[PDB]
Amino acid sequence: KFYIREPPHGSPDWLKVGLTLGTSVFLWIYLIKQHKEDVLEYKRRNGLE
Amino acid sequence: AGRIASFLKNAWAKEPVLVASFAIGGLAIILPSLSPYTNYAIRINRATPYNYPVPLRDDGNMPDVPSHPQDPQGPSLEWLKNL
Amino acid sequence: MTMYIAFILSTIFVIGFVGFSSKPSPIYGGLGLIVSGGVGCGIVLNFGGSFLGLMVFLIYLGGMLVVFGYTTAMATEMYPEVWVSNKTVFGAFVSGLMMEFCMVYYALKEEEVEIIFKFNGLGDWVIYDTGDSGFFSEEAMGIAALYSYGTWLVIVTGWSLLIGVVVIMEITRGN
Amino acid sequence: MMSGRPGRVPLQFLPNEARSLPPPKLTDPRLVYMGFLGYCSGLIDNAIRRRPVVSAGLHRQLLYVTSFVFFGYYLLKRQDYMYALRDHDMFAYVKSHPEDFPEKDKKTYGEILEEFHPVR
Amino acid sequence: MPLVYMNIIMAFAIALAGLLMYRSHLMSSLLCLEGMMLSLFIMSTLIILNTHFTLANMMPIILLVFAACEAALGLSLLVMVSNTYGTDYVQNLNLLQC
Amino acid sequence: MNPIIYTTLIMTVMSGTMLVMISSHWLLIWIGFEMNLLAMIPVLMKNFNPRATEAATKYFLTQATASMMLMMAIIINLLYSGQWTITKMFNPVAMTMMTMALAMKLGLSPFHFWVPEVTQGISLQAGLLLLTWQKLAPLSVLCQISQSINPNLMLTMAMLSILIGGWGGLNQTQLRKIMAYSSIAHMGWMTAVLPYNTTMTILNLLIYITMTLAMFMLLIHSSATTTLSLSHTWNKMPVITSLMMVTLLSMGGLPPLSGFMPKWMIIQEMTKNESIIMPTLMAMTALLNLYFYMRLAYSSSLTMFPSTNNMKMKWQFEHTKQMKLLPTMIVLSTLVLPMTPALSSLN
Amino acid sequence: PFFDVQKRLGLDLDRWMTIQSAEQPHKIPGRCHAFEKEWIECAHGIGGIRAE
Amino acid sequence: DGPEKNYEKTMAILQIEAEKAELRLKELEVRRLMRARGDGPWYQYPTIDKALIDHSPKTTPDN
C-alpha cells in the first residue's frame, strides 16, 4: 500500500529476528553460567571453599 | 552420464591439447601417492653419504652400532643392490 | 697483473652504475645497468655463486629486455634523448667518477677510509674461507633447500605471483 | 607496563591463572555502563536508517546490548588480570630487591623544621 | 669491510640518488629503481656466500622474485599514464594538484 | 572490477599486513610489505580516472622506494650481525635507514607529501582503506623495534608529522585532503609516544582507527567530497550531519569524548618520563586540528547552508547501501573515556 | 614478532632460517657456527637489555 | 547523619587514597629500575631461542 514498490523491510524477516533472539539468549546464559563457574572456581582455588 | 561423456569427447576433439595436458597432469599428482616405490626413492636419497659418518665414542652397551666397518651388524642396503 | 680483478669487477660495476643513474636516454641507462649486471655476475661468480650469478644473468637480462619493450613502445618520442643531449649528464657522470676514485685512492694510502662505515683497502681476496665442499656445491644445495625447508617462502611467493598477474590484468584492463 | 613476560602464551585472551582473581560482579558499575554503551549503539542504528529511534526492532537492540555487555565482561577479567600482574611482580621485585627500596625513616612534625611563610 | 662491499654499497647510494633525484623521466627513474635492487641482490649474495649461510642461499632469488614484480607493475603503470598523457615525462604529471 | 576479484584483493592486502604482524624473519616482513603494495595498487585504480592513475603512481613510487630502503636496513643489520630475527638493531645507520624507510610508508616526516595527494586522487572507500589499514604494518614493525630507535629522530619526526599535519589542513576544502592532513597529525601523535611505551601508541592507533571508519562511513553515507557538498547535506541527512558534528568534536580531543583519551594518556606517560616540554607542543598544535575541525562543523551542522531546488527530489530516495558497523563505529569513537583502564588489556 | 602465531599454534614458519646454526641442509655448518652457538646459548631467557 | 558517619567515612577515603598514591610513586620507581637493570619479569625484550641451534656432527669438524 501507499508506496507502490514493496517496502524493503515491509515484512517481518522471521529468520533473522529468530537468530537475533536465539543469540541474545545464548550470550546471556553463557554469560551467567560463566560467572557462576568463575566464582566457584575462585573459591575452591584460593581456599575459600 | 551422457553429458559428461559427450563433453569429454568434444574436448578431445575441440581442444585435444587441453585434454592431453589436463590428463597427464592429473596423473602427475595422483600416481606418486599411489605408487609403492616412492618410499624406495626416499631410501635411495638417505643411502647416499654426502658427508662422513662420524663415529661414536665407544663405552660399552651399544650392540647395535658395529665395532668395525666390516662388521655384520649395522645398517645394510642389500635392497639397493637388488634394486 | 690479474690479481686485482676481483676488485676491478666491482669498480667497473660502480662507474657503469653512475652512467646508468646519470639520467641519460632510457636505453643508455639500460646499457649502464647491462654492463653493471654483466660485471657483477663476475663478482658473484668468482665468490663461488655460480648458480646465483647465472640466475641473475638470465632473469635480469630478460627483465631489462621487457623494460625496453615499452621504451620503444610507451617511452619513445619524435626526438629520443642522446647520452650527450643534456649538459648536466656529463657533470653527473664525472661526479660519479671522482668520488669513488678519491675514496679508493685513500683506501690505497691509509686503508682506513672513514666514509660512513669502517672499511679496509686491503683487497678482497682475504675474506674468502678455507675449507671444502665434498661432492656438493653449497650454493646449489642451499637454493635447492627451497622445496624442503622453504615451506612458507614458496607458498607466499606463488600466491604473490598469482595476485601479481591478477593486478597486472586489472590495472591494464582499460575498462 | 609487558609483552616480554616469561611464560606468556600468545594470542591467549584469558590465561588460566587469572581465575584465582575475583571475577567481575554482574552488577559491576563499569559492566553496566558498557551495557548502557550497548543502548547507544542500538539507538543510533535506528537513527541512521531513519527508523523509529525509540522502538525500531528491539531484536537489533537485544544483541546490541547483550554482545557489548558480554565482550565487556571478558575484557574486565583481562583488565583486572593485567592490573593484578602489574601489582603482582611489583611486590616480587620489591621484596627481591630490598636495597633499591630503603626503609625510609618516619619522623613526626615535631622533629622537622618546616619554615612557615607569612602570606600577607 | 673490503672494497667489494664499498663498491656495491656506493653503487646503491648513487642508485638512490639517480632514482630519487628525478631528472625528467619516469621510465628511466624506475629503471634506476630496478638497478637499485640489483645492487642489493649482489650485496645480499656476498655475505650469504661468504658466511656459508646455506639456507639463506635461497633468499636472493626470493628477494629477486618480488622485486621484478614491482617493476612488473611499475612499467605497467607507466603505460597507463602514457596512453592518456602521451609520454613518461614527469612535468605534465600535474593534474592531481588540489 | 569483478566482485570476486575485489574480494581477492581485499584479502591479499589483509594477508600482506597479517604476514607483517605475525612473521619473525625480516625477509618475511618485507615480503608482506610488498604483497600489500602489489595488492593495494589495483583497488586504488578501481574507478579508473586520471586522478586515480596519478594517485596510484605516486603511491607506487613512494612505497617502492621506501621498501627498497627497508631492504637496505635489512641487508645492513644482516651484514653487521648475521641475524634475520626482528629485534634491536646492531648497526646505528641501519636503524636510521629503517626509520625513514618505514616513515615514508607512514607519511610522518617530509616523506609525507604523497598521502594528501593520493587521498585526493582515489575514491573515498579507497581512502578509508589507505588511511586505516595501511598503517597497521608499519606501526607493528616500529613497535617490534622500539628497543633501539634514536629518540631524537623519532621525536622530531613525529613533531613535524603533527605540525605540517595541522598546518596543511587549514587551507584545504576537499574533505579527503583535510582527512589526510588530520591522519598525518594523528600519525605524529602516536609516533611521538612510540619510543617510550608502545601500549599507548597501540591505544591511539585503535582510537584513530575507529574514529577514521566512523568518519569515512559518514562521508560516503553523505556522498560528499567538498566542504560545500557536505554543507548541502545538512538538509537530506540531519541525523548523519549531527553525528558528523559529534565525531568532529571527538576529532580534536575535547573531553569527555573518546579523542581526548589518547592525548591524555600520551601526555601523562610523556610526563612520567621527564618529557615535559615535548607534550606541550602537540597540546598547543592540536588547536590547529580543531580549527578546520570547527570549520567543517560550521559548514556541516551548526549553521544552515543554502540548499538547492533540485536537491528536493533527493528527499524521495533513501540510502540503500546499509554500510554496516556504523552505529557501533560511532559509539566506540564517542563514549569510551569511562573505560580508560581497559588500556591495560593491550599491555 | 607482534602476534607470534608460530609458537602459539605450534609450528615453525620462518624460524628455520633466522639463524645459521639451525639444521642446515646435509649438515653444512656456517662460517661462524661455533661463535653464534656461543652467543645464542649465552643469551637465552636473559632479556635483551640485560643480555647485551 | 551524625558527624561520626562522615568523619569515619572520610579517614577511610584518605587511607585508601594514600595507599594508592605511594603505590603510584613506587610503581614509577619500580618501572624505571626494571627498565634500566632489566633483572625482573617485565621490560624484558626478546632474544634468540636456544632450541633453534643444532649440535649434531657436521660435514666439516671444528664448526
The count of other CB atoms within 10 Å of the CB of residue G8 is 13
Nearest to E56 among G17, G29, G32 (CB): G17
| Cβ pair C135:B51 closer than 8 A | no
- The answer to whether the CB of F38 falls within 8 A of the CB of C163 is yes
Positive or negative: CA dihedral D66, D70, D71, D75: positive
Grid cell, residue C81, equals 634523448
CA atoms within 13 A on the CB side of D66: 19
Q: CA B4, B8, B12: angle at the middle one, nearest 5? A: 170
**What torsion, rounded to 10 degrees, do the Cα atoms F171, F175, F177, F183 define?**
110
Q: d(Cα H8, Cα H4) in Å, to the nearest integer? A: 6
The count of other CB atoms within 10 Å of the CB of residue F80 is 17
- The answer to whether the CB of C123 falls within 8 A of the CB of E2 is yes
The count of other CB atoms within 10 Å of the CB of residue D105 is 5
Residue D39 touches chain F, beta carbons under 8 Å: no
* Mutation for testing the B interface, residue in C135, C137, C147, C148 having most B CBs under 10 Å: C135
Q: How was this structure determined?
A: cryo-EM
Task: Give the position of cell 540510502.
Answer: F319
H helices of chain A, in order, are 14-46
Q: CA F234, F237, F240: angle at the middle one, nearest 5? A: 95
Grid cell, residue C132, equals 671444502
Positive or negative: CA dihedral F178, F180, F183, F188: negative
| Bond before F262 cis per omega within 30 degrees | no
Q: d(Cα F139, Cα F160) in Å, to the nearest integer? A: 17
Nearest CA-CA partner of G14 in F86, B40, F189: F86
* Burial class of residue G43, CB neighbours in 10 A (0-12, 13-18, 19+): middle
Measured in whole angstroms, the distance separating CA C140 from the mean position of its chain's CA atoms is 20
DSSP sequence for G8-33: HTT--SSTTTSSTTS--GGG---TTH
Resolution (A): 3.4
Distances (CA, A) of E81 to C81, C175, E33, F56: 20, 15, 18, 10
Residues from chain B contacting residue G27 (CB–CB below 8 Å): 51
Residues from chain C contacting residue H62 (CB–CB below 8 Å): none
- The answer to whether the CB of H41 falls within 8 A of the CB of G36 is no
**Minimal Cα–Cα distance from C135 to chain G, Å?**
12
In our burial notation (b when 16+ CB lie closer than 10 A, e otherwise), range D40-60 reads bbbbbbbbbbeeeeeebbebb
Tally of residues, chain A: 49
Nearest CA-CA partner of C37 in C67, C57, C52: C57
Residue of C nearest to F57 (CA): C171
In our burial notation (b when 16+ CB lie closer than 10 A, e otherwise), range H18-49 reads eeeeeeeeeeeebbebbeeebebbbbbbbbbe
Q: d(Cα F214, Cα B52) in Å, to the nearest integer? A: 66
DSSP sequence for F230-287: HHHHHHH-HHHHHHHHHHHHHHHT-TTSTTHHHHHHHHHHHHHTT--HHHHHHHHHHH
H helices of chain D, in order, are 29-48, 58-96
CATH topology of domain E3-92: Helix Hairpins (1.10.287)
Task: Give the position of cell 642508485.
Answer: E15
Q: d(Cα F281, Cα C144) in Å, to the nearest integer? A: 56
DSSP sequence for C58-72: HHHHHHHHHHHHHHT
Q: d(Cα E35, Cα C33) in Å, to the nearest integer? A: 6
Distances (CA, A) of F216 to F55, F106, F244: 18, 19, 10
Grid cell, residue A36, equals 557462576
As a CATH number, domain C5-173 is: 1.20.120.1200
- The answer to whether the CB of F104 falls within 8 A of the CB of F111 is yes
Grid cell, residue F333, equals 569513537
- The answer to whether the CB of F25 falls within 8 A of the CB of F97 is no
Q: d(Cα F170, Cα F164) in Å, to the nearest integer? A: 10
Residue G20 touches chain H, beta carbons under 8 Å: no
DSSP E89: B
Domain boundaries along the sequence of chain C: 5-173
Which chains touch C (3+ CB pairs under 8 A)?
A: B, E, F, G, H
Residues sharing a CB contact under 8 Å with residue B74, sequence separation 6 or more, in sequence order? B64, B65, B66
- The answer to whether the CB of F187 falls within 8 A of the CB of F136 is no
Residues from chain A contacting residue D57 (CB–CB below 8 Å): 17
- The answer to whether the CB of F66 falls within 8 A of the CB of F134 is no
Q: d(Cα H33, Cα H39) in Å, to the nearest integer? A: 9
Q: d(Cα A24, Cα G1) in Å, to the nearest integer? A: 37
**Minimal Cα–Cα distance from H36 to chain C, Å?**
29
- The answer to whether the CB of F80 falls within 8 A of the CB of E56 is no
Residue G19 touches chain E, beta carbons under 8 Å: no
Grid cell, residue G2, equals 607482534
Residue G46 touches chain F, beta carbons under 8 Å: no
Nearest CA-CA partner of F241 in F259, F258, F221: F221
Which H residues in the span 32-61 are in contact with B, Cβ-Cβ below 8 Å? 57-59
**Minimal Cα–Cα distance from G24 to chain B, Å?**
13
Q: d(Cα H54, Cα H63) in Å, to the nearest integer? A: 11
Q: Do chains B and H touch (3 or more CB pairs under 8 A)?
A: yes
Chain B interface, Cβ < 8 Å to G: 50-51
Nearest CA-CA partner of C77 in C19, C33, C20, C27: C27
SS3 of E41, please? helix
The count of other CB atoms within 10 Å of the CB of residue F201 is 25
Q: d(Cα E97, Cα F120) in Å, to the nearest integer? A: 9
SS3 of D39, please? helix
Residue C135 touches chain B, beta carbons under 8 Å: yes
**What torsion, rounded to 10 degrees, do the Cα atoms C131, C136, C142, C147 define?**
-160
Q: d(Cα D43, Cα D52) in Å, to the nearest integer? A: 9
Here the contacts of F49-52 (C-beta below 8 Å, separation 24 or greater) are F50/E84, F50/E85, F50/E95, F51/E95, F51/E96, F51/F120, F51/F121, F51/F122, F52/F121, F52/F122, F52/F123
Residues from chain B contacting residue C136 (CB–CB below 8 Å): 50
| Cβ pair H33:D90 closer than 8 A | no
> What is the number of CB-based contacts under 8 A between chain B and chain G?
3
Positive or negative: CA dihedral C107, C109, C110, C114: negative
What are residue F257's phi and psi, to 5 degrees? Answer: -70, 170
Residues just before a chain gap in chain D (C–N exceeding 2.5 Å) are: 1
Grid cell, residue C112, equals 682506513
Q: d(Cα H37, Cα D10) in Å, to the nearest integer? A: 25
Residues just before a chain gap in chain C (C–N exceeding 2.5 Å) are: none
